[PDB]
Amino acid sequence: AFIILDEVIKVTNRRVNAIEHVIIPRTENTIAYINSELDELDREEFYRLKK
Amino acid sequence: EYGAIYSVSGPVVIAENMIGCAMYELVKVGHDNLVGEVIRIDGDKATIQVYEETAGLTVGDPVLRTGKPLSVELGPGLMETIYDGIQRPLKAIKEESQSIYIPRGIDTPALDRTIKWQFTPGKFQVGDHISGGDIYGSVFENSLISSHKILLPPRSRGTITWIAPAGEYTLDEKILEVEFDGKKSDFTLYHTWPVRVPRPVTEKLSADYPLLTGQRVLDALFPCVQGGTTCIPGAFGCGKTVISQSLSKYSNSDAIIYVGCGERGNEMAEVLMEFPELYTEMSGTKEPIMKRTTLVANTSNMPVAAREASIYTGITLAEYFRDQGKNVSMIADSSSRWAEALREISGRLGEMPADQGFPAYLGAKLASFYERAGKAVALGSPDRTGSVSIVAAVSPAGGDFSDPVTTATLGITQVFWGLDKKLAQRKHFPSINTSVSYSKYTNVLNKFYDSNYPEFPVLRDRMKEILSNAEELEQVVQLVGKSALSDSDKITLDVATLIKEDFLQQNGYSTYDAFCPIWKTFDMMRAFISYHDEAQKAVANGANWSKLADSTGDVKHAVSSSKFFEPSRGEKEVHGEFEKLLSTMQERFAESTD
Amino acid sequence: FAINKKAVEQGFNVKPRLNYNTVSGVNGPLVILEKVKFPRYNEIVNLTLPDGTVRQGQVLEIRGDRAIVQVFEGTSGIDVKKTTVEFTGESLRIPVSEDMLGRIFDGSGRPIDNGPKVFAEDYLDINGSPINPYARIYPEEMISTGVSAIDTMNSIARGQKIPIFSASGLPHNEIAAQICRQAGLVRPEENFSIVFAAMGVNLETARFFKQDFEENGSLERTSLFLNLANDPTIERIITPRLALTTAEYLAYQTERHVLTILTDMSSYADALREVSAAREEVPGRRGYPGYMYTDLSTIYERAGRVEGRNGSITQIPILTMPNDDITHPIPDLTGYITEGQIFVDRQLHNKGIYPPINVLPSLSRLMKSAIGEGMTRKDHGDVSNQLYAKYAIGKDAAAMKAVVGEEALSIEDKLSLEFLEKFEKTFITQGAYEDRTVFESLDQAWSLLRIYPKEMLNRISPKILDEFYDR
Amino acid sequence: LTTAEYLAYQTERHVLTILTDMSSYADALREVSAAREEVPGRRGYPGYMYTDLSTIYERAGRVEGRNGSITQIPILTMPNDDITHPIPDLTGYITEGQIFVDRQLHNKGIYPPINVLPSLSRLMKSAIGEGMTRKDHGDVSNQLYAKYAIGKDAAAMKAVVGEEALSIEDKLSLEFLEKFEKTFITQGAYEDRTVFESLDQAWSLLRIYPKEMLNRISPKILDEFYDR
User: Fold this and answer.
1) CB C207 to CB B438 under 8 A?
2) Strand locations in C234-380, DSSP E?
3) Could you give the C-alpha distances from B227 to A22, B205, B211, B331, C433, in angstroms and in order?
């Protein structure tokens, strides 16, 4: 039981660390980039309509 | 009186020297008399929309006024025909010209003036006072509809003077003379009505009768009441391609008018072949369904100004049919294409879009179009009663719901049947998403339910709760795995899977599965929910569901196969079979529970 | 008392009315007169089509000797030869009398209850002047909604402005009807009135509203302003002004505690985008006009108690997020202007919970001035916090149940898990016609709290625990 | 298109037109109407491009009077490998389904790099069937599509979690996806196969699965064919 618990907790802890330190930053940077692009499009659309 | 052309650009034409024109007159432009209608007026110049192709025109051409907004001809002979966006018969054109093309400027009467119709005088006599919308005779049209009533057009009253007796008449001999300040009133078998003005009606009512689409998911979770709106995404594989056919074949619709706004063009040929040989078995196996259905087909290439009015034509025809006290159910094809046509017209005019390229009045126009639906009592002496049930079909625009047309439709439409990408990816043909779709007629339908089946409401709510619980549990189970789960959790998960793979799924091609009556759906629903609650009760009192499942496998297979009981055998013996199955399920659980 | 002198002075003075025949162009829903004399911005006109039909309109712009009228009921059928345009000589005004209550008015205010004319006690400009901030005070007492999930946890102090966010396919209208039916003060009434203006609604919903308010007797405490979906948009933007003006008149010239509801604002936003497209103002964010902030403020901020008069007022605007996102401009601005919000979850509705309200995102900033002694019992503020905390705990406990079994959960976790389900199925779940007083809701909340051991209810003060936990 | 129409409808001989790079045509169309100052459409393109492309495409099909046929196979070019661009969006709106091409498959050196997941042909159901073709054609395709989707989603989920959270279904689906991609789609430039040979290969691939998880297939065909 000791061995099994040790290996299981090691695996889960490293997985949690990897998720926290990799996934969330990677996705939120993309979120910001997408927001920036969608904000960019409307600017030129408004310019064209103004013209 | 004529006006000279002064500028041309695409379909838009700017005439001039034309004062006294109204806002929507019909102007037969060009030496060939192409049909158009004014849009904008300023001084004498008047912008003209053109419903055909403007090629080869030259300035100085004649422009003639008519003085009457766009309208369609109404009377006998509509049924079992086909028209374009301006009510031009297609059989007649091809037969006359023997060509495969539609010659420009070709005009033909909307209803054949040669055929002779048998007429029976109504109940009115000389000297009586009559009002618009009153019946004064009936005419036989087809063995499928033998009571094509005759109505005095609204906005017309007075005292009848002379009436034609019975006999044979083509729809040109005057058969009525109404006395008034002037005796100009002379009425034939047909009349006309402007499209854009909704037809008058005495009063509206509240719809409280269901429509039986024959599909368990829709008829169980999101019922569609008679005389009610709807929205259905089109995917060609989500069943929508066949739900219209099923509705035509089974739902009690005295008349239906399919409308194709932006059809691809080959699908038009396919459906045109299909309709003439679809059979309905009600008071005799009447083979021709086309005897009970017109058709307004408009492909992409026809001028945009025709596409923008096709649906108006269709809804006006449906309203006229409603006038006679029937139960019409129109079905559009693509509201998205119609909105696209509206956007194109607005862009051509020189307007200013405000909703991602669309005009602003799009919502108002959609609301106006939708508002003509609903049950109502006619405007006449015999006190008729009709109903119109439009079933629009929005088209996905890429994103699920970001498009503004979907937002506007949701703002007004009562019943919505969303689309699920995942189920479509897995060939689960009915892809209705049970997380976003909804229907607001559930509240009212209980009045009908309790009269025949009191258990639908609570049972349906229980099923929906089961599905929601199963999906929310699935949300988390993936991130970890199905290891630390109680017996009840596994029970709920397996029951949800069984319902989703057996109840919801159904193919519209097998005889036993083509149409599912209400009673069969009720019984099969009872089976599943009773099974689930029995299992929950058994486990709650202490037991291992793993061991129990081994014994239950038999009854689980039984309930999974229950759907294969084809209907149309006894309609009551099937209910006895289901009751016996339920009793045996109770017995098997009781004995195995030992 | 000298108001009679002013009434007669401007009362008995008839003036003629011009009549034009110089229609000189048209552009969609507009109309362009040519040789008007001394035009007046924002007038009212009565067109006369060549067929004898009659419509209305309201000017928008004026060049040197020119007017730009827009017609309510479309523009089809008009002509530049025979149409006659009649001016009015003064902006839109509403007939105001004490006896509106009971009657039903259309969008423009013409009665549609098959009844006689209003017999106005006065006339007013629809959009009155703003309230002077220096003459304004704070809410104080509470209003009894009758809904368990609202009164107990999101009480409404008179003078507040609490919107009710909701999604498209949700029964928000039924909740609004129930609220209007069950409203009233609290007696630890001769002073209560309701204004229920609906804009952009189906025919079925309008018929249901009328029929329900008829046979439930609530009609004679209300005055509805119905406006269907197929009616002109300009009338739509007009209707809330009429409702607010009449409510303000009642409250601040008859001293009646009044409550107003709107039942929609998204359709109002649509009607507003439509205008400024007739004009050539370029679209703003998401296509909406940029200046919506000002006019929405004008709509909302005619609320709150007042220094001198004993009257009061309250608002419950109802929104509809397009795709269930708070980032949309309409909900953002509404939250910016108003205090707190009330949510409506889709999942709860799916599970058959009525009213399908979720309390975790809900909030009411003026609660602290609503509850208390005399105004209500003394234990409201503590039970509110306790129940909120325990519901929040129960949600995550249910979340962890699936991953770590049930035994590993602490005793606290099991108790919270049971309490969550009991709460959802009993407390929030309220019948469509079940009316509860605040006291009854408090008693039921105490019953639910009795699940936990007395000691463990940490957030509750010892005094209240000792006083009420018994039995 | 005019030449094709003439040949097909006035000489009674079947035709097959192949016009390439509609993207350049659309770009040129945008260039004109930009010298003008017309109300620009989405992403600057003219509003009436829908009508223009409808005019271009509709010249196709068959007519009873004649017995010739005309078939269109236009070639597109998405600018940034995105199907939401107006050109492909309208093209999909008009035509009957499209055949997609993916960058990933080409990167993995697979020819022809066709991605079936977003592709479809609406007229398939009407054309295929008994007599016309083998009866199993109408359901083996659906079964293969379902299995491909399952394998793709299982691989996508495993990429972040791993094997541990995989049931038997995921393990089978990953290997099936690998074999399918590397054997069925791939074929030589000059290599061709009749419908029946492709069907036999499809059954060979499907025979990996136990007889009971092929739910989407009808019992009769399954019993008849999966047996051997």
Assistant:
1) no
2) 257-261, 315-316
3) 55, 10, 9, 12, 28
Residue numbers in D near B300 (CB within 8 A): 50-51, 54, 57-58, 94
Nearest to residue B221, comparing CAs of B499, B509, B571, B511? B499
Breaks (C-N over 2.5 A) in chain A follow: none
Strand partners of residue C318:
C164
Q: Which residues contact C11 (CB under 8 A, 6 or more apart)?
A: none
Q: Tell me how crowded residue D164 is: count the other CB atoms within 10 A of its CB.
A: 9
Look at residues C162, C165, C174 and name the one whose alpha carbon lies nearest to residue C201. C174
The DSSP output letter for A19 is I
φ, ψ of residue B492 in degrees (nearest 5): -60, -45
Looking at residue C109, its amino acid is: G
Angle at D33 between CA D27 and CA D36, to 5 degrees: 145
Beta-carbon contacts of residue B539 (< 8 Å; ≥ 6 apart): B487, B488, B491, B545, B548
Q: Do D44 and A48 touch (CB under 8 A)?
A: yes
Experimental technique: cryo-EM
Chain A touching partners, 3 or more CB pairs below 8 A: C, D
Q: Is B387 helix (H, G, I), strand (E, B) or coil?
A: strand
Q: How many CB atoms lie under 10 A from the CB of residue B230?
A: 24
Compute the distance between CA of residue D145 and CA of residue D116 in angstroms, rounded to an integer.
8
Distance CA B189, CA B173 (A): 8
> By C-alpha distance, which of C135, C104, C114 is closest to C198?
C104
Cβ atoms of C345 and C358 closer than 8 Å = yes
Q: CA-to-CA distance for D177 and B417, rounded, in angstroms?
A: 33
| Cis preceding-peptide flag for D210 (omega within 30 of 0) | no
Residues of C with CB under 8 A from a CB of A: 282-283, 285
Q: Which residue, D170, D169, D148, is CA-closest to D159?
A: D170
Query: Which residues face C46 on adjacent strands?
Result: C86
Q: Does C89 touch chain B (CB under 8 A)?
A: no
C289: cis peptide before it, omega within 30°?
Answer: no
User: Any idea where the domains of chain B sit in the sequence?
Assistant: 1-70, 71-114+188-439, 115-187, 440-594
**CA quadruple D39, D45, D47, D52: dihedral positive or negative?**
positive
Q: How far is CA B218 from CA B238, B393, B422, B433, B454, in A?
A: 13, 15, 18, 11, 19
- The b-or-e profile of D84-95 (16+ CB within 10 A means b, else e) is ebebbbbbbbbb
**Closest residue by Cα to residue D98 from D111, D81, D83, D110:** D83
DSSP state of C134: G
Contact B20 C402 (CB under 8 A): no
Question: With 0-12 CB in 10 A as exposed, 13-18 as middle and 19+ as buried, what is C393?
Answer: middle
Q: In angstroms, what CA-CA distances link B214 with B293, B526, C251, C360?
A: 20, 18, 55, 41
Q: Does residue D27 sit in helix, strand or coil?
A: helix
- The terminus-to-terminus CA distance of chain A in angstroms comes to 74
Among residues C363, C343, C300, which one has the least CA distance to residue C155? C363
